[PDB]
Target: Nucleoside diphosphate kinase, cytosolic
Amino acid sequence: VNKERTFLAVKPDGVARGLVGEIIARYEKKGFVLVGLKQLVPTKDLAESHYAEHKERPFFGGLVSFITSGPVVAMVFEGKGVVASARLMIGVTNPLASAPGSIRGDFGVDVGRNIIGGSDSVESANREIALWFKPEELLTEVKPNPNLYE
Amino acid sequence: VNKERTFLAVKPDGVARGLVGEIIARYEKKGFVLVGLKQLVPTKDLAESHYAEHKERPFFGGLVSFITSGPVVAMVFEGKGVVASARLMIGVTNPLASAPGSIRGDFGVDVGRNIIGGSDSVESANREIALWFKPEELLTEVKPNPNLYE
Amino acid sequence: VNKERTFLAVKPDGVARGLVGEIIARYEKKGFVLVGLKQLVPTKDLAESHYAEHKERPFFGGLVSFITSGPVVAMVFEGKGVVASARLMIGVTNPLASAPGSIRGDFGVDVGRNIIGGSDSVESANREIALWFKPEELLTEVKPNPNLYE
Amino acid sequence: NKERTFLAVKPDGVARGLVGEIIARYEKKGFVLVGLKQLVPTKDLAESHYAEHKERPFFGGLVSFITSGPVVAMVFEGKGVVASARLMIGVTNPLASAPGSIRGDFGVDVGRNIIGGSDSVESANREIALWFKPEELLTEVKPNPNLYE
Amino acid sequence: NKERTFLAVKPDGVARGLVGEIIARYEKKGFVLVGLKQLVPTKDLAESHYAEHKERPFFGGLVSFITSGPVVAMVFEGKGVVASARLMIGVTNPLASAPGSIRGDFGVDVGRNIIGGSDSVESANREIALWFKPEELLTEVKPNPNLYE
Amino acid sequence: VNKERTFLAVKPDGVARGLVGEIIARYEKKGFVLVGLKQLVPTKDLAESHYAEHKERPFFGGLVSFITSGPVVAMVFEGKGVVASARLMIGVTNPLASAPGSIRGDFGVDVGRNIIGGSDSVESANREIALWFKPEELLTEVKPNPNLYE
Ligand SMILES: C[C@H](Cn1cnc2c(N)ncnc21)OCP(=O)(O)OP(=O)(O)OP(=O)(O)O
Ligand SMILES: C[C@H](Cn1cnc2c(N)ncnc21)OCP(=O)(O)OP(=O)(O)O
Ligand SMILES: C[C@H](Cn1cnc2c(N)ncnc21)OCP(=O)(O)OP(=O)(O)O
Ligand SMILES: C[C@H](Cn1cnc2c(N)ncnc21)OCP(=O)(O)OP(=O)(O)O
Ligand SMILES: C[C@H](Cn1cnc2c(N)ncnc21)OCP(=O)(O)OP(=O)(O)O
Ligand SMILES: C[C@H](Cn1cnc2c(N)ncnc21)OCP(=O)(O)OP(=O)(O)O
Ligand SMILES: [Mg+2]
Ligand SMILES: [Mg+2]
Ligand SMILES: [Mg+2]
Ligand SMILES: [Mg+2]
Ligand SMILES: [Mg+2]
Ligand SMILES: [Mg+2]
Model:
């Protein structure tokens, strides 16, 4: 449906490099609606829950340590196929292999400093949204631009 | 071969969302020359002729109704391989599947509100140009830049 | 009223330099609505009528010769105080004295190649619009955008 | 270098998709984002924020509009950020705002002015305390040697 | 239309990745690049560059900073390019520079004001001679009919 | 591996069309560090050495003649995988087949006027850097943004 939602986190590197506005603008221009937005410094608990699927992996510690190393801009966007579209707009895991035009393709070089990370699926998105945002922090009335949907 | 021409129409949704300038700029930056331009509200007969290839399709009535629902900005651009190039610059049928960097990839989310449409072939381009424009509305003297062509 | 209109002409230099889209986008982003648009090569009669106030000035011939020397993109924009606003967005007569941020301030260096010219008053706008466009080429209804106007 | 100001992207700015454009302008300028959140203001929050205009005829409509939809509240930090942020926005009448400024580039109606910033340090501190909780604001920052001497 | 000015994107401008942004602004304006190179300025070059301030206490600071890292030196040609380039940059204090100007859009501190241009034709000729060898400057340009009448 | 370097040349057409800043900005935004930069008019000897691999090609003369026909902006960028990344950011040989988002995809239409050319390998990059720049023209002290590499 056109009410699908995804969670996007502009990580510490993205925030430190002043790419917050650039990124938000790309999603606004696309037609997706911002239903949740806030800057915070993630706690270790939040970080470990966010990357829970990788808890047994060697790089787990580094992922958690980095996303908690500084301010992060957390956001939720709503729109048709937003989860898959947001991932396409970001690029692939490795910024160097991402095509120009994509966020990582235009601004990143390292996998561990890949600027932003979005939900990999609807299931993960619903899980992440509930983890990072309280219900009261999410819009309940969403009406995009009627020129966007048939 | 550098005199090839194609027909492009910023549809009602593209105009309503204020994307006319953005789109024209992309083609200008590319090196293509504007040889025809005008804003108009398509009539039903023009729309039905324009979309004649889908006259039997179930979504035909919808295509016609929408393209005639508001102002459209019709354009004709000239340049080497402009027909196929213009299509590549627009993206693919489904905006959600279009790569970032393309017009639809950057601004669209629904197939029925795909922002802009270009001729799919030289054959179609010549037909569409004659259908939407009068001879006197098209430049006869062009010759772009020596910086663009060998 | 919110239905005030002004006439803007991207002159041959602006068109040749590929600034048409850039210019249209600036006015679209501002909130003004395009109600008339077309590219044409002005006739001497049209040019002389357009610059009638300067009929007895030494530079009259030059203004006329230049605006008819190549394609021009004529447009009409509608919105509250659009006449004075469009002039402000363009800059002052001399591009070198125009502040960065304005069209001439950002793109021009010569008075005779000042890219674009807008109506200097509501009276001139109405005169110019009727001169460059036929009634059938102008949108009749626009309906105020709730996000732009009270 | 620790001065802070409160900026609110109004419902019209949010609805027109100008949030990113605006944040980018302040990031590019060199100011640091120390507070950020989207919310739909309540009547009380709106009236307190715009208390200085409470006696004016348009106050009712002003309050009704800012509470009509989502607003993106922000706090930016940097030397002279209060006056600088105002200069970047333009003047009260968007039509009189010079191109290059936010209102100059995007607005046409005084009642749909896109964004509003604190007019003084005193007002900024009041507004910041009104819209944000202490824990929602950064306490770090770390001076950037490329921005300040 | 042969007038020329010297522009130096200082270490802060280079470190902040604004070299392309700045060059693009002058290219779009219609001015022609007739000299360009990145270098790390030496003390003797810097002291001559800021000679008008040699008796002032901040002379040492201006010299130390412009020689602290990579600088992109450029020479642009065009009608009234000296005064125009200054207007495009803004005023000495970036906080007081209007949005739309380089310093107005990107700077916050006087000592980190990103770029500096010649203040007069006399200074431009003097500075161009100090920073560039004749062989590093274009001799063939040819006025663009779309920019000049 | 983060010290890898590549040679990029904005050819006469790219310079003449005013794309130098646009191009440099793209590489700056990506995170790569500018370690060498200068505008010059290549000599025949430099050109023939640069295109040595095509000495027996029928188009060799044309490549040499064009790159020496006007000012060129030569540059060297440093960063992880910069050689392959720079090529990807430029696009493919034929600008018409280059994807929107890439330099050639956004600005070119002719193979012979492809705007910019980058080293095709580390081997070629080191050869080209030594050919176009003296060691003293290249930075030895490099400090990329601290948020770019893990
Ligand atoms: C009152 C002002 C703009 N405004 C908003 N609505 C109106 C209206 N109907 N008539 C006149 N002015 C109006 O918005 C408040 P604000 O949003 O704070 O903008 P400002 O730039 O801070 O302006 P001020 O210093 O006066 O607070
Ligand atoms: C696990 C993934 C990539 N990754 C990030 N760091 C590492 C590492 N050290 N080893 C292997 N993989 C690594 O990072 C999480 P993420 O940055 O979210 O990438 P995604 O957007 O999910 O593709
Ligand atoms: C038939 C085509 C896309 N299309 C494909 N299927 C549909 C549908 N169900 N509703 C609306 N449009 C649809 O629309 C005409 P067009 O707008 O020209 O798109 P194109 O550039 O040709 O891909
Ligand atoms: C008369 C004015 C400027 N002008 C343009 N060319 C000349 C010239 N040769 N001598 C003196 N003035 C000149 O041009 C008309 P215009 O380009 O419309 O400027 P405006 O937007 O009306 O300020
Ligand atoms: C002297 C001027 C500003 N300035 C720069 N640093 C200082 C300082 N510490 N005290 C007083 N003035 C200072 O810097 C030279 P510049 O950066 O070239 O400014 P300009 O573009 O010439 O206006
Ligand atoms: C041989 C290749 C493209 N080319 C292919 N054929 C030609 C031709 N006839 N004229 C000019 N260039 C031609 O040009 C070298 P280059 O411009 O470096 O492209 P590259 O980035 O190496 O792919
Ligand atoms: Mg992930
Ligand atoms: Mg079609
Ligand atoms: Mg005039
Ligand atoms: Mg106020
Ligand atoms: Mg100075
Ligand atoms: Mg090559």
About this structure: The first helix of chain B runs from residue 12 to 16.
